[PDB]
Design an enzyme around this catalytic site. Structure first.
Site, PDB file in Angstrom:
ATOM      1  N   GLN A   9     -12.133  15.427 -50.383  1.00  0.00           N
ATOM      2  CA  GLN A   9     -11.648  15.386 -49.014  1.00  0.00           C
ATOM      3  C   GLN A   9     -12.688  15.942 -48.076  1.00  0.00           C
ATOM      4  O   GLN A   9     -13.224  17.005 -48.327  1.00  0.00           O
ATOM      5  CB  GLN A   9     -10.386  16.249 -48.906  1.00  0.00           C
ATOM      6  CG  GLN A   9      -9.760  16.282 -47.514  1.00  0.00           C
ATOM      7  CD  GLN A   9      -8.774  15.157 -47.384  1.00  0.00           C
ATOM      8  OE1 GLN A   9      -8.109  14.784 -48.376  1.00  0.00           O
ATOM      9  NE2 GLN A   9      -8.693  14.568 -46.178  1.00  0.00           N
ATOM     10  N   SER A  87     -12.485  18.462 -56.594  1.00  0.00           N
ATOM     11  CA  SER A  87     -11.066  18.288 -56.300  1.00  0.00           C
ATOM     12  C   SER A  87     -10.691  16.815 -56.512  1.00  0.00           C
ATOM     13  O   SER A  87     -10.734  16.336 -57.645  1.00  0.00           O
ATOM     14  CB  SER A  87     -10.746  18.792 -54.887  1.00  0.00           C
ATOM     15  OG  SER A  87      -9.348  18.929 -54.699  1.00  0.00           O
ATOM     16  N   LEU A  88     -10.342  16.086 -55.453  1.00  0.00           N
ATOM     17  CA  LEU A  88     -10.146  14.635 -55.605  1.00  0.00           C
ATOM     18  C   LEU A  88     -11.187  13.959 -56.518  1.00  0.00           C
ATOM     19  O   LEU A  88     -10.840  13.070 -57.336  1.00  0.00           O
ATOM     20  CB  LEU A  88     -10.129  13.891 -54.270  1.00  0.00           C
ATOM     21  CG  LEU A  88      -9.662  12.408 -54.319  1.00  0.00           C
ATOM     22  CD1 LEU A  88     -10.792  11.423 -54.602  1.00  0.00           C
ATOM     23  CD2 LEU A  88      -8.495  12.174 -55.277  1.00  0.00           C
ATOM     24  N   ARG A 112      -0.919  12.266 -56.128  1.00  0.00           N
ATOM     25  CA  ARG A 112      -1.599  13.508 -55.700  1.00  0.00           C
ATOM     26  C   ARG A 112      -1.580  13.592 -54.173  1.00  0.00           C
ATOM     27  O   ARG A 112      -1.152  14.597 -53.598  1.00  0.00           O
ATOM     28  CB  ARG A 112      -3.046  13.567 -56.201  1.00  0.00           C
ATOM     29  CG  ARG A 112      -3.722  14.918 -56.045  1.00  0.00           C
ATOM     30  CD  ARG A 112      -4.991  14.942 -56.881  1.00  0.00           C
ATOM     31  NE  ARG A 112      -5.682  16.244 -56.905  1.00  0.00           N
ATOM     32  CZ  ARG A 112      -6.552  16.663 -55.984  1.00  0.00           C
ATOM     33  NH1 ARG A 112      -6.834  15.913 -54.942  1.00  0.00           N
ATOM     34  NH2 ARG A 112      -7.128  17.842 -56.096  1.00  0.00           N
ATOM     35  N   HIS A 193      -5.101  24.239 -53.555  1.00  0.00           N
ATOM     36  CA  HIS A 193      -5.734  25.040 -54.589  1.00  0.00           C
ATOM     37  C   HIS A 193      -5.366  26.499 -54.514  1.00  0.00           C
ATOM     38  O   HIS A 193      -6.243  27.384 -54.616  1.00  0.00           O
ATOM     39  CB  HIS A 193      -7.249  24.882 -54.532  1.00  0.00           C
ATOM     40  CG  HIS A 193      -7.734  23.512 -54.944  1.00  0.00           C
ATOM     41  ND1 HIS A 193      -7.584  23.037 -56.193  1.00  0.00           N
ATOM     42  CD2 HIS A 193      -8.382  22.514 -54.218  1.00  0.00           C
ATOM     43  CE1 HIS A 193      -8.108  21.799 -56.267  1.00  0.00           C
ATOM     44  NE2 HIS A 193      -8.596  21.480 -55.058  1.00  0.00           N
ATOM     45  N   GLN A 241      -5.386  21.955 -62.203  1.00  0.00           N
ATOM     46  CA  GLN A 241      -6.348  21.890 -61.140  1.00  0.00           C
ATOM     47  C   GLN A 241      -5.700  22.073 -59.766  1.00  0.00           C
ATOM     48  O   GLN A 241      -6.288  22.708 -58.880  1.00  0.00           O
ATOM     49  CB  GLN A 241      -7.081  20.554 -61.207  1.00  0.00           C
ATOM     50  CG  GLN A 241      -8.251  20.471 -60.254  1.00  0.00           C
ATOM     51  CD  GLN A 241      -8.327  19.151 -59.526  1.00  0.00           C
ATOM     52  OE1 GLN A 241      -7.373  18.721 -58.898  1.00  0.00           O
ATOM     53  NE2 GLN A 241      -9.469  18.508 -59.596  1.00  0.00           N
TER      54      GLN A 241
END
Ligand SMILES: [Cl-]
Length: 281
Positions: A9, A87-88, A112, A193, A241
């Site tokens: 992102q 992340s992504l 997600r 997160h 995660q």
């Protein structure tokens, strides 16, 4: 030795993956059918869906990264020795490494994106200049026990994560500490997160378990451990995660330790190339 790394992102931008869609028209069509809208238009037409809304960002990023990879591999002939994603982007690394196929990744990042997209009352900020140890101390010394570390991006770029009003309190702390160069709140409304991703993590765990995972061709360095995925704990490592620190500085360290290591950033922008340069410095 080379590592392909996939941005998350913040790397999306209208025009991303221009011209790659019609080159993999089956994948584009498959994405369209799974998503309920035109993935090409999300990515490249200013008149359609806003690519900055996380629910759309993640599928946009995921598809663009996926396809950018297929093109790179075809073009160089070379498959990478390691893969990692921020992340992504981790979902692009597992997919390039053969954990699951295009479709399976996209279903995953659709759910997600949607779950992340409803998170509310949250906030994140990047703190530049202090270590993760230093950020931890300051948080606590100042009794901000509600803020988690969401991103370890460089040895001195740390992204913090918590309730909106908590991120605001921390402004005053971090902007009045020696060695802090910058406090920059992120343009998000969920505490990603962090412990506040708990329910979402779970809901998302159950979704991950519903898919069959294949064994990895490439080693994928996990966001959660900064270690390669141990092949028997693939779903567990991925499901962990959502509400755990993205340990990116250390995942880049582990790869530097592996030998004479090159990094290539597959996907839009040069955000990770940036973080890799600063980690390498
Ligand atoms: Cl070694």
């Amino acid at each position: 030795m080379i590592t392909y790394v996939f941005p998350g992102q913040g790397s999306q931008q209208k025009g991303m993956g221009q011209g790659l869609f019609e080159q993999y028209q089956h994948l584009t069509d498959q994405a369209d059918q799974i998503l309920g809208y035109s993935i090409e238009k999300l990515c490249t037409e200013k008149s359609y869906l806003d690519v900055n809304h996380t629910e759309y960002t993640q599928p946009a990023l995921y598809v663009v990264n996926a396809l950018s990879y297929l093109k790179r591999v075809e073009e160089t002939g070379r498959k990478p020795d390691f893969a990692a994603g921020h992340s992504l982007g981790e979902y692009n690394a597992l997919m390039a490494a053969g954990a699951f196929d295009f479709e399976t990744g996209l279903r995953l990042v659709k759910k997600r994106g949607e779950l992340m997209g409803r998170i509310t009352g949250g906030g994140m900020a990047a703190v530049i200049g202090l270590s993760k140890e230093q950020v931890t101390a300051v948080l606590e010394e100042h009794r901000l026990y509600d803020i988690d570390v969401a991103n370890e991006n460089t040895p001195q770029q740390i992204v913090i994560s918590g309730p909106k009003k908590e991120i605001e309190k921390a402004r005053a702390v971090f902007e009045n500490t020696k060695d802090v160069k910058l406090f920059h709140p992120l343009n998000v409304s969920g505490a990603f997160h962090s412990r506040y991703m708990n329910e979402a993590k779970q809901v998302f765990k159950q979704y991950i378990d519903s898919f069959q995972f294949a064994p990895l061709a490439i080693p994928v360095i996990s966001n959660v451990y900064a270690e390669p995925y141990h092949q028997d704990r693939l779903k567990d490592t991925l499901s962990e995660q959502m509400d755990n620190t993205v340990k990116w500085t250390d995942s880049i360290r582990f790869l530097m330790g592996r030998g004479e290591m090159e990094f290539a950033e597959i996907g839009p922008g040069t955000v990770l190339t940036g973080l890799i340069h600063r980690i390498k410095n």
